[PDB]
Each structure stands twice: as structure tokens, then as C-alpha cells.
Coordinates of C-alpha atoms in Angstrom, one line a residue:
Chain A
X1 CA -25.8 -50.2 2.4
X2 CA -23.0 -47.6 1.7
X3 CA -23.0 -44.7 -0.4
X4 CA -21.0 -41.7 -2.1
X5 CA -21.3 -38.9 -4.3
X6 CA -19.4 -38.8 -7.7
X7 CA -18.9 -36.3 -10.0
X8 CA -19.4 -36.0 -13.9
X9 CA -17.9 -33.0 -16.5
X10 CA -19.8 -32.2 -20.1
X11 CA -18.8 -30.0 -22.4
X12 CA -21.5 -28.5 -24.9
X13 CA -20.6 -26.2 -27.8
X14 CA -22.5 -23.2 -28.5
X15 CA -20.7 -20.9 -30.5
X16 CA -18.3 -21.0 -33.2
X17 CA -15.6 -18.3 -35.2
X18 CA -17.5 -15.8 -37.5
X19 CA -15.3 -15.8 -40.7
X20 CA -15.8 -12.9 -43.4
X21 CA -14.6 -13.0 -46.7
X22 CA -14.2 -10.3 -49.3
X23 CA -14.2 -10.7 -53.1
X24 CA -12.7 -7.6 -53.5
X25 CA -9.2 -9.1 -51.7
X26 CA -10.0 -12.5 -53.2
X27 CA -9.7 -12.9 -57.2
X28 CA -9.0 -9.2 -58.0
X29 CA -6.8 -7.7 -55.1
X30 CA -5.1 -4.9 -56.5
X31 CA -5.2 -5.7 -60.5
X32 CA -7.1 -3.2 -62.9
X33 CA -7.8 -5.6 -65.4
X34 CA -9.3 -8.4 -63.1
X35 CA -12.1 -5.7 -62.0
X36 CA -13.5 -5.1 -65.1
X37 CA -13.8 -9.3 -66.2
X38 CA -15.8 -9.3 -62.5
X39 CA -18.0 -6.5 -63.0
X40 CA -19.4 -8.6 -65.7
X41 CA -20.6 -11.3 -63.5
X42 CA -23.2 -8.5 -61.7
X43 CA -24.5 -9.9 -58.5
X44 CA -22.6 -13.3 -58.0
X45 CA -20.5 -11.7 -55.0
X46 CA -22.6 -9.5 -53.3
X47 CA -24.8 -12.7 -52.5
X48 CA -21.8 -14.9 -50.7
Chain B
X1 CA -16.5 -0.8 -47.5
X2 CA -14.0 -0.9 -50.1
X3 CA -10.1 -1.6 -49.3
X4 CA -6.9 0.1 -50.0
X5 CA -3.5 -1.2 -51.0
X6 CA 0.1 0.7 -50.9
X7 CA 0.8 2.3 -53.5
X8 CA 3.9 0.3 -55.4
X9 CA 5.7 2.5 -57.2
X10 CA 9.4 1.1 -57.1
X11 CA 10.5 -2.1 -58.5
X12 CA 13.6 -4.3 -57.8
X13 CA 15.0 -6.7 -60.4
X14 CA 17.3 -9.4 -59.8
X15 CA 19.4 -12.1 -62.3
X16 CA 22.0 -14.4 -62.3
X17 CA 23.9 -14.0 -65.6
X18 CA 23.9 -17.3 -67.2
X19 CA 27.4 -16.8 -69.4
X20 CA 30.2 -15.2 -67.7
X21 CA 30.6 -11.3 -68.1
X22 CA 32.4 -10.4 -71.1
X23 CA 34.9 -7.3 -70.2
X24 CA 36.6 -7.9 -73.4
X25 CA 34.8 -5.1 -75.5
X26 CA 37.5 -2.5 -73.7
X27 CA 39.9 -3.8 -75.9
X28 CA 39.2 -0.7 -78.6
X29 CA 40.7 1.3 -75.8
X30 CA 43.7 0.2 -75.2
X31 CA 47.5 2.1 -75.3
X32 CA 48.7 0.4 -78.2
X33 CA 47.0 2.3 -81.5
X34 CA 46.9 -0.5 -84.1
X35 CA 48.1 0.8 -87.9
X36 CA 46.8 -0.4 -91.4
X37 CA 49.5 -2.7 -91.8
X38 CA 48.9 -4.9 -88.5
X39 CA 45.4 -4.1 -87.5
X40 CA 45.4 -6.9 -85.4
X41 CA 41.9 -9.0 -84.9
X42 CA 40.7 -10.7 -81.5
X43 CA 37.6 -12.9 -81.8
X44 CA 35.1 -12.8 -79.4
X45 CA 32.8 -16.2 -78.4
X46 CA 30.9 -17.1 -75.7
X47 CA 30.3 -13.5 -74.5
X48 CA 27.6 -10.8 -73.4
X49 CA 27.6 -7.0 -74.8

């Protein structure tokens, strides 16, 4: 007999933080000896 | 690319000493000459040179 209008919020998510990560500041910051041992490993970190 | 880090060329060292500093091995230059027929001896223990 009687009406009304109501109202109704959503919240959806869409995006999300894009995180980069470097080997290079990782294992062998800024050690010498830690570049060569990785270097041995080839193409493990180009991949991540 | 590649990074870059400063280049750390000082250094900075810091230590408690654990036994207490000796300040005895000033004793050879004291006023008082010792002689052959004294020549008085003072031990030293528990000390850092």
C-alpha cells in the first residue's frame, strides 16, 4: 500500500600495488664476492 | 638498469674495554732513577699494554 526507496553501497576491487623486486639489491647488494657465486646460477633471476 | 651505492670509504670502530686501562707502564719514567743496589720491582696483573 505504501512504499519508499532505499539505498545500497558495493565496493568492488579492481586494481592492486605493482611491486618490483631486484636481485641485484636483494642477496648481493653491494658485496664483490656475492656477484660472482650468482653469476653462476645464469638465468634464475632474470626470469622472477 | 643497474644500481649504485655510496662509496664507503671511512670506517668507525667502537669498544668497551673489558679490564680497566692499565696506566701503570709510565712508571719507567718516573723522577726517582733507580740504582743497581735497589732496583726496585713493581708487578703488574690484571692489566692491558
Amino acid at each position: 500500500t505504501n512504499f519508499t526507496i532505499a539505498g545500497h553501497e558495493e565496493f568492488i576491487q579492481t586494481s592492486s600495488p605493482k611491486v618490483t623486486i631486484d636481485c641485484s639489491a636483494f642477496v648481493c647488494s653491494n658485496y664483490a664476492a656475492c656477484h660472482d657465486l650468482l653469476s653462476e646460477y645464469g638465468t634464475f633471476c632474470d626470469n622472477i | 638498469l643497474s644500481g649504485f651505492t655510496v662509496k664507503p670509504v671511512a670506517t668507525v670502530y667502537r669498544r668497551i674495554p673489558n679490564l680497566p686501562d692499565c696506566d701503570i707502564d709510565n712508571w719507567l719514567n718516573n723522577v726517582s732513577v733507580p740504582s743497581p743496589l735497589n732496583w726496585e720491582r713493581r708487578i703488574f696483573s690484571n692489566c692491558n699494554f
